[PDB]
């Protein structure tokens, strides 16, 4: 349809994302303008632990699992699942680190909205309330990683 109507469809979804509900319009618009879409089928690794990463992901369709290598275990342990409306991949950006867990599609036809580091920094990373929320969440993820003896 129009660019505007496509944008409205993305705006409506992004405003249903709890993380983004309070973001200023101009930064939401920048996410709409800069996002890309990636599709995955069941078992695909969206993120692999021990890889460089500088992109942030919003799950628009489907479910993924979060797994992580830990001490005393040979296979990665299942931390949680994420569903439509949730997000992942901020930690590498905020911690300036390699990817710290695997993100694996649990269903066929998973769809992610992806933005790069500069876009992230200029939107999420620039709106104080959200920046601080994610920085604090990442600090807790560090303590969870320590608790479970992440390798
Ligand atoms: N180290 C680590 N420990 C966890 O206990 C954990 N739980 C999750 S789901 C989650 C998603 C977003 C927020 Cl703010 C909080 C939790 N994640 C996510 O996995 C991704 C791997 O790639 P990355 O770039 O390291 O970002 C990471 C995180 O997004 C975790 N990472
Ligand atoms: Ca456009």
UniProtKB/Swiss-Prot annotation:
Tissue expression, per UniProt?
Highly concentrated in brain, lung and intestinal mucosa.
Briefly state the modifications made to the protein after translation.
Answer: Myristoylation mediates membrane localization.
The effect annotated for residue 145 to A is:
Reduces cGMP binding affinity
What stretches pass through the bilayer? none
Q: Which residues form the signal peptide?
A: none
UniProt binding sites for 3',5'-cyclic GMP 2: 80, 89-92, 99-100, 145, 148
Q: What is the effect of changing residue 148 to A?
A: Reduces cGMP binding affinity
Q: Which residue stretches belong to region cGMP-binding, high affinity? A: 19-149
**Where located?**
Apical cell membrane
Q: What does this protein do?
A: Crucial regulator of intestinal secretion and bone growth. Phosphorylates and activates CFTR on the plasma membrane. Plays a key role in intestinal secretion by regulating cGMP-dependent translocation of CFTR in jejunum. Acts downstream of NMDAR to activate the plasma membrane accumulation of GRIA1/GLUR1 in synapse and increase synaptic plasticity. Acts as a regulator of gene expression and activator of the extracellular signal-regulated kinases MAPK3/ERK1 and MAPK1/ERK2 in mechanically stimulated osteoblasts.
**What disorder does this protein's entry note?**
Spondylometaphyseal dysplasia, Pagnamenta type: A form of spondylometaphyseal dysplasia, a group of short stature disorders distinguished by abnormalities in the vertebrae and the metaphyses of the tubular bones. SMDP is an autosomal recessive form characterized by short stature and mild platyspondyly with no disproportion between the limbs. Mild metaphyseal changes are present. Acromesomelic dysplasia 4: A form of acromesomelic dysplasia, a skeletal disorder characterized by short stature, very short limbs and hand/foot malformations. The severity of limb abnormalities increases from proximal to distal with profoundly affected hands and feet showing brachydactyly and/or rudimentary fingers (knob-like fingers). AMD4 radiographic hallmarks include mild to moderate platyspondyly, moderate brachydactyly, iliac flaring, and metaphyseal alterations of the long bones that progressively increase with age. AMD4 inheritance is autosomal recessive.
The record describes its quaternary structure and partners as:
Interacts with GRIA1/GLUR1.
Protein family: Belongs to the protein kinase superfamily. AGC Ser/Thr protein kinase family. cGMP subfamily.
The name on file for this protein is: cGMP-dependent protein kinase 2
The organism is: Homo sapiens (Human)
Read off the lineage from the record. Answer: Eukaryota, Metazoa, Chordata, Craniata, Vertebrata
